[PDB]
Design a protein around this ligand. Structure first.
Ligand SMILES: O=P(O)(O)O[C@H]1[C@H](OP(=O)(O)O)[C@@H](OP(=O)(O)O)[C@H](OP(=O)(O)O)[C@@H](OP(=O)(O)O)[C@H]1OP(=O)(O)O
Lengths: 96, 106, 49, 843, 351, 88
């Protein structure tokens, strides 16, 4: 219940349904959330200093979810390859 | 007629470089101010000092108008354009180490 | 539940009636409702792992 | 606040006493008045050092006041006539602190001390000298008020056979002659040369040096710097956080000095000390016979002891002043330095070797004994400034200096402290050292070692792609973060956190490092908490996935402390914290700006000064971040702020009030229209220019008149009998009419209460002298006079009724219109009181 | 009646904000004393810059050149804005001049260099201005923003405000009217603050321009004050990037009886000189500018040519409207009709 | 207060912010002999449970100052420490 990721869920909800007055009444085009983009940005920052066998990146299952769409598929496939490059320990994680 | 030239000496190249004779070198360290140092260098090859603010810190520590410089904040600028020297002094620290040729009334 | 917490002060003009009339579906990830469902699936699968 | 205040008073009376006076000054920073006067009097009469510590400290911080000045002036006037040494100089420092307070009584107090100082010119004579010396530095204007008595009395009193006077009175003459030059000199040179023609040696030489030294600052500016021994292109933050005769007689000045240096060679230590100070400054004015007389005394004083310190200082100035001719005496000077160093005082020897270069290749061989002396702050300051001026072998300098540091750090406490200060002060060319320094701070129980080893490692990681270096930086920075979170001593925790600058933000944005930083946002010390939220806010661009969720949770808590905590300090701390968030994480806060602003406006309409000051500084930072989304609230905040600007009753400072108003007008773009809505705006802002004394505040009051634009004078016009009496009447009528008019003005308002008796005695005398022509004035006088009787109290009532009786006797039949009111008055104020009964019956 | 009395009478009237009375004093001087008794300084006080220049020219022709008459004539040139002639007099006379007049020269020489856009000359002149003056701080802060020395710029502005303390306080004591001059100095200072933001925040640009436009309209319609303000904003905004400012400016020059300056302004906005190519048709790009030029030409008594241009222009407008009317450009079409309507009205009244 | 907390349970967090100002004043100036009114208020905070989530940052500093103050008596310090134990 007290995991940090829960705080991210609140912000994601907040930004998503702050637009609802404008979507319903004004008819504004629903801009997509930066969530998945920003989560890939966090994974990229991890890769920069990821050589050591430290705690694995929290966002690994998010990278999986990003592969399902096309909007961020190119960026994820790049980062996922760079991660697998780090070593065979990482490829084991991605398979698990 | 747009540019202004206040330097009587037409050229000083190859005359400075020769040791001794007309001038004796001196190094002036000028501290920055709230509104600026107050000196201008407008010499093409020798980078002679164009003007000095009489009320500025530079005029208090010597720095007469009829002078030539060859090095700023350590870096030797004996042969560069005046505009390039203006870039170096602004991009450098607040306090500037300057070498003045300081011709001895000749 | 989000609309019952104290954090609603941060979004004035968000009542339950707006939540009832949220546009989209739970399948179409390009809609607002499908966006949240997709995000939620990622966040929950991340906490678990 | 009384018993324990007197308990610690006798404690400080009987290092520990200075800290008890600093804590008393720190307690006076927050802070009854009678008990402080009694506590000061308790410490005064008893010991004398603690009494001066009590007086001076309170006056400076609590502020000089008419009550405090009148009382403590008698205490200071009692100490001066007779006191011990050391205590006298402390009492003279309490004069200087009082004289720089900036009060109206300062003009009287300073001129009281100066006039009595001239009367004296031994605890009397040296006291007057310290008073005049400190006042000459602190107060140039009133020191110049008595210059002709100054020179005449002092040239008599200086040459008396005393040492303490000669030390201070020349420093007073120094402070005086500097003020005379920038704005006497013949009378100075006459009395100085009269004195020269062994007590009458070292004083004349100092007076002659004053004319030499002031005429040429080049000599003094070298001595002044040796005694002590950002960028213009930077982009400002996008959100602004809240904030002649001395040259003509100079020839004879050195002429009588060249002979004095030979005359007073070893006559009556003190004279030799002043000679070796003066000789270089005289030579720097005019350098061979003058040099030969100098060199004989200087070179002989270097071999001797108790002067070697000042001898090299003169020798270093002589080497710079006399360039070529000094080169003959190089073998003499260098042999003495080569003999002086092996014994290890020599901190000055190195300073003068730096001034000797201020060069030859011989210095390369001179380095191997120099470094063998040892680590001193003078040595490393010299070698640093040596590579500045002559960078011929800067690599060889760093080679030997790093070899010295390596020999040291391969191997008590205070030396390791200074060795780390050296290692982190100036640049160097370091992996093992830093991984070994990671061991020292963890395994040191010394607070000062940990605090310095932290400052050192943070400085030595300025070189921050190689995997090994990254893994090393990651290891060290993880250990540093652990120390910054876990160390008990909060000073060490604050230093470490402050040292984690922009440079490290690439590493701090790692998950593990960010989990540590979050813990740090709940530190016991509010100041550390402030610094942590700034760092995390700055990282909200690097790793938004972590930082943005966490700052939202923190924002909720901040707004909870604001709204629901009913406590000044907690609310003040919460506002301050929201300040740092707005500035460092503006993207996060932009969607939530309307909630925050409503919460803050509600705080502004609540019925502690620092809370409103921090709330205003936050609203001002929101203005810039809002980016035109706060327009709907601008007219609300404008009313609030204009309500707070007018009057000085409001606790909140006008400065920050005016600053936040500036930021609103600027960002939101409310120009010209506010002038129409609030017409007093131009009258309020031109009133600060006539009232405010602070520059910063006056500066803002202009910057806000700037942003609001320059209103057209017509647009501002749209936005907003005594001579006549004489013009008509003859003078014999005019005089009653003007007298009455002048009395009627006093009759209204509370001014009448002070002058109740005199006003009505006049009006009665006027009516009696006029006769029946006073009837004219009846409609003016009566309604006021009756309302005065209504609101008057006590004794005046009876007197007014007495004088009303006189009035009625003069007016006679004409009083009929006002008679009904008079009866009502009588009916209301008739009491069984015997006094008023006799009065009313007469009326 | 004495000349000294008349001079003092003029200065008293200006302090009392009664310009018309002081002008009447000069008319009295003209009649009863002629012209020799009228010094050029009298025109300078009355802001008769055209007649003051004629006076200083007549005086400098007969009398030998003097520091006082040179500065007087140069002061007139800067008020008119003839930056070409003012910079010519500077470059000619530098070594010929003493250091006392030098400090009274550079404040005007820098203004001229800034106007012409020659930044090397401007740097030389600003150093000669004394730092203790308000202007000395202001002009140093301007050369800061040209070189992007933002940190030093803010420093110099603060000292400039500090030096305006003495001026603002003195003028405020005796009515708002006298304080207006100081008020304009702070206006230009706070505008220089909003040029630093303009050079740092691309997102804030259109907001700053709207603020600038609304601020200038609250300011008084004096041409001198506008020239100062527009020269400042021109540090980061070319005249083409904001037409309506420079068109309203030209209109003031027209109403104030300075059509020469109005003409130069309009030529600079048009892009070319119609005055030179009389046979060619007027350029259609920027039509609101062209229209302003024609109604200026009419005031210049070239009213047969103006009328002919208007006939050509409206034929061009109505053809440019018809062919370019799509659904997209509806706001442009609405502004083009509002223009064409005013064109047709001018056609009529002119006919 | 203790009886309202057990009665409402989860719904108490709506009303707790009104009571917080008085509870924070109790800690600042408690003149109770041996601060037994403070000890009682600690025992109440234990019942508050997961209600304190949104307000723990407010309550905790007073509690922390309570068990770290040496002037304060040992019973009241044990009561504060045992409270933090439970709330954990
Ligand atoms: O001087 P005019 O020939 O009579 O022209 C005026 C004048 O325009 P200019 O800016 O070119 O001088 C008005 O401006 P003001 O100087 O009075 O401020 C302007 O009015 P606005 O400022 O409201 O636009 C008005 O325009 P309009 O007819 O749309 O009201 C316009 O008239 P013409 O264009 O018809 O000559």
């Amino acid at each position: 219940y007290m995991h940090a990721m829960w705080q991210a869920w609140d912000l994601a909800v907040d930004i998503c349904l702050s637009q609802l007055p404008t979507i319903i009444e004004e008819g504004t085009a629903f801009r997509h959330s930066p969530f998945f983009a920003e989560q890939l940005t966090a994974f990229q920052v991890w890769l920069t200093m990821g050589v050591e066998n430290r705690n694995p990146p929290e966002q690994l299952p998010i990278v999986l979810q990003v592969l399902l769409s096309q909007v961020h598929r190119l960026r994820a496939l790049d980062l996922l390859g760079r991660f697998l490059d780090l070593g065979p320990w990482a490829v084991s994680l991605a398979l698990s | 007629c747009n540019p202004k030239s206040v330097l009587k000496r037409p050229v000083t190249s190859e005359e400075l470089l020769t040791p001794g004779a007309p001038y004796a070198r001196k190094t002036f360290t000028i501290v920055g101010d709230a509104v600026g140092w107050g000196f201008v260098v407008r010499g093409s090859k020798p980078c002679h000092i164009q003007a000095v603010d009489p009320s500025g810190p530079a005029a208090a520590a010597g720095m007469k108008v009829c002078q030539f410089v060859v090095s700023v904040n350590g870096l030797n600028v004996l042969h560069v354009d005046y505009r390039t020297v203006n870039n170096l002094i602004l991009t450098g620290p607040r306090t500037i180490v300057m070498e003045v040729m300081e011709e001895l009334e000749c | 539940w989000f609309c019952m917490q104290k954090c609603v002060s941060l979004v004035p003009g968000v009542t339950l009636d707006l939540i009832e009339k949220i546009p989209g579906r739970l399948n179409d990830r390009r809609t607002p409702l499908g966006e949240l469902n997709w995000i939620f699936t990622a966040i929950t699968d991340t906490i678990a792992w | 606040x009384x018993x324990x205040x007197x308990x610690x008073x006798x404690x400080x009376x009987x290092x520990x006493x200075x800290x008890x006076x600093x804590x008393x000054x720190x307690x006076x920073x927050x802070x009854s008045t009678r008990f402080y006067d009694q506590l000061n009097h308790h410490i005064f009469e008893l010991e004398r050092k603690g009494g001066i510590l009590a007086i001076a400290s309170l006056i400076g911080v609590e502020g000089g006041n008419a009550t405090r000045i009148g009382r403590f002036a008698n205490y200071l006037r009692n100490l001066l006539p007779s006191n011990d040494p050391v205590v006298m100089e402390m009492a003279s420092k309490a004069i200087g602190r009082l004289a720089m307070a900036g009060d109206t009584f300062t003009a009287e107090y300073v001129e009281f001390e100066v006039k009595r100082a001239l009367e004296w010119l031994e605890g009397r004579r040296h006291a007057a000298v310290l008073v005049l010396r400190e006042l000459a530095i602190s107060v140039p204007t009133f020191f110049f008020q008595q210059v002709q008595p100054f020179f005449d009395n002092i040239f008599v009193a200086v040459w008396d056979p005393k040492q303490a006077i000669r030390e201070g009175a020349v420093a007073a003459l120094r402070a005086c002659l500097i003020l005379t030059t920038q704005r006497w000199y013949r009378h100075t040179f006459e009395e100085a040369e009269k004195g020269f023609d062994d007590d009458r040696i070292h004083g004349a030489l100092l007076i002659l040096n004053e004319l030499v030294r002031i005429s040429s600052m080049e000599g003094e500016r070298l001595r002044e710097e040796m005694e002590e021994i950002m960028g213009f292109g930077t982009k400002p933050r996008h959100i602004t956080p809240f904030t002649x005769x001395x040259x003509x007689x100079x020839x004879x000045x050195x002429x009588x000095x060249x002979x004095x240096x030979x005359x007073x060679x070893x006559x009556x230590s003190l004279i030799q000390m002043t000679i070796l100070n003066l000789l270089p400054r005289l030579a720097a004015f005019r350098p061979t016979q003058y040099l030969q007389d100098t060199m004989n005394h200087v070179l002989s004083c270097v071999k001797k002891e108790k002067e070697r310190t000042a001898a090299f200082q003169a020798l270093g100035l002589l080497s710079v002043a006399v360039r070529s001719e000094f080169k003959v005496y190089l073998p003499r000077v260098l042999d003495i330095i080569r003999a002086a160093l092996p014994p290890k005082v020599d901190a000055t020897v190195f300073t003068c070797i730096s001034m000797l270069a201020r060069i030859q290749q011989d210095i390369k061989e001179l380095l191997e004994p120099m470094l063998a002396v040892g680590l001193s702050p003078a040595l490393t300051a010299v070698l640093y400034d040596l590579s500045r001026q002559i960078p011929q072998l800067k690599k060889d300098i760093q080679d030997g200096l790093l070899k010295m540091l390596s020999l040291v750090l391969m191997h008590d406490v205070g030396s390791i402290t200074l060795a780390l200060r050296t290692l982190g002060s100036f640049e160097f060319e370091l992996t093992q050292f830093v991984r070994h320094c990671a061991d020292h701070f963890l395994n040191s129980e010394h607070k000062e070692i940990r605090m310095e080893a932290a400052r050192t490692c943070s400085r030595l990681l300025t070189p921050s792609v190689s995997q090994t270096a990254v893994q090393v930086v990651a290891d060290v920075l993880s250990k540093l973060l652990v120390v910054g979170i876990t160390d008990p001593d909060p000073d060490i925790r604050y230093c470490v956190l402050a040292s984690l600058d922009e440079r490290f933000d690439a590493h701090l944005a790692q998950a593990e490092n960010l989990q540590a930083l979050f813990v740090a946002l709940n530190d016991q010390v509010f100041e550390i908490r402030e610094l942590a939220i700034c760092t995390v806010g700055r990282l909200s661009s690097m790793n938004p996935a972590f930082v943005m969720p966490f700052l939202r949770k923190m924002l909720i808590q901040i707004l909870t402390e604001l709204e629901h905590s009913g406590i000044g300090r907690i609310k003040e701390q919460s506002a301050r914290m929201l300040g740092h968030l707005v500035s460092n994480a503006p993207r996060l806060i932009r969607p939530y700006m309307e909630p925050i602003l409503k919460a803050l406006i509600l705080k502004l309409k609540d019925p502690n000064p620092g809370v409103i000051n921090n709330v205003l500084a936050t609203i001002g930072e929101l203005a810039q971040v809002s980016g035109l989304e706060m327009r709907k609230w601008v007219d609300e905040l404008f009313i609030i702020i204009m309500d707070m600007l007018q009057d000085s009753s409001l606790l909140a400072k006008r400065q920050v009030a005016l600053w936040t108003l500036g930021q609103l007008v600027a960002s939101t773009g409310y120009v010209v229209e506010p002038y129409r809505k609030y017409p007093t705006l131009l009258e309020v802002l031109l009133n600060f220019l006539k009232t405010e004394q602070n520059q910063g505040t006056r500066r803002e009051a202009i910057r806000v008149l700037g942003l609001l634009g320059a209103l057209d004078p017509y647009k501002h016009k749209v936005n907003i009998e005594m001579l006549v009496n004489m013009g008509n009447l003859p003078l014999d009528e005019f005089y009653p009419a003007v007298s009455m008019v002048a009395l009627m003005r006093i009759f209204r308002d509370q001014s009448l209460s002070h002058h109740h008796t005199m006003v009505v005695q006049a009006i009665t005398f006027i009516f009696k002298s006029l006769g029946l022509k006073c009837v004219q004035f009846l409609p003016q006088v009566m309604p006021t006079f009756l309302n005065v009787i209504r609101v008057c109290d006590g004794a005046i009532r009876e007197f007014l009724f007495q004088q009303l009786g006189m009035l009625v006797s003069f007016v006679k039949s004409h009083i009929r219109p006002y008679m009904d009111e008079i009866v009502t008055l009588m009916r209301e104020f008739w009491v069984m009181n015997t006094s008023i009964q006799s009065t009313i019956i007469l009326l | 009646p004495t000349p000294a009395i008349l001079e003092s009478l003029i200065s008293i009237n200006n302090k009392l904000q009664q310009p018309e009375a002081a002008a009447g004093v000069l008319e009295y001087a003209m009649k009863h004393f002629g012209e020799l008794e009228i010094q050029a300084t009298w025109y300078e006080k009355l802001h008769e810059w055209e007649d003051a220049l004629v006076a200083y020219d007549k005086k400098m022709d007969t009398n030998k050149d003097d520091p006082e008459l040179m500065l007087g004539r140069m002061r007139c040139l800067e008020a008119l804005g003839e930056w070409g002639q003012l910079h010519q007099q500077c470059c000619e006379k530098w070594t010929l001049v003493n250091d006392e007049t030098q400090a009274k020269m550079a404040r005007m020489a820098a203004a001229a260099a800034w106007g012409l856009g020659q930044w090397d000359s401007m740097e030389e002149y600003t150093c000669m201005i004394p730092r203790d003056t308000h202007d000395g701080a202001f002009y140093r802060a301007v050369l800061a923003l040209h070189q992007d020395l933002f940190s030093l710029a803010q420093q110099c502005i603060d000292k400039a405000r500090d030096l305006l303390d003495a001026e603002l306080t003195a003028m405020a004591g005796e009515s708002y009217s006298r304080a207006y001059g100081a008020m304009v100095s702070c206006h230009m200072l706070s505008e220089l603050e909003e040029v630093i933001q303009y050079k740092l925040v691309p997102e804030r640009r259109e907001i700053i321009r709207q603020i600038w436009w609304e601020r200038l309209q609250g300011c008084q319609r004096i041409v001198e004050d506008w020239q100062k303000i527009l020269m400042v904003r021109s540090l980061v905004v070319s005249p083409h990037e904001d037409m309506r400012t420079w068109l309203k400016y030209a209109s003031l020059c027209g109403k104030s009886g300075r059509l020469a300056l109005a003409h130069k302004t309009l030529v600079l906005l048009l892009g070319v000189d119609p005055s030179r190519q009389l046979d060619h048709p007027l350029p259609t790009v920027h039509p609101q500018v062209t229209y302003a030029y024609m109604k200026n030409m009419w005031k210049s008594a070239r009213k047969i040519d103006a009328f002919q241009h208007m006939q050509h222009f409206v034929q061009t407008m109505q053809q440019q409207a018809q062919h370019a009317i799509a659904t997209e450009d509806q706001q442009h079409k609405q502004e083009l009709h509002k223009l064409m309507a005013r064109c047709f009205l001018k056609l009529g009244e002119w006919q | 207060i203790e009886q309202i907390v057990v009665a409402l349970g989860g719904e108490f967090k709506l009303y707790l912010p009104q009571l917080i100002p008085h509870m924070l004043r109790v800690f600042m100036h408690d003149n109770s002999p041996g601060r037994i009114v403070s000890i009682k208020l600690l025992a109440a905070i234990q019942l508050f449970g997961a209600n304190l989530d949104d307000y723990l940052h407010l309550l905790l500093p007073p509690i922390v100052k309570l068990f770290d103050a040496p002037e304060a008596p040992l019973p009241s310090r044990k009561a504060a420490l045992e409270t933090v134990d439970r709330l954990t």
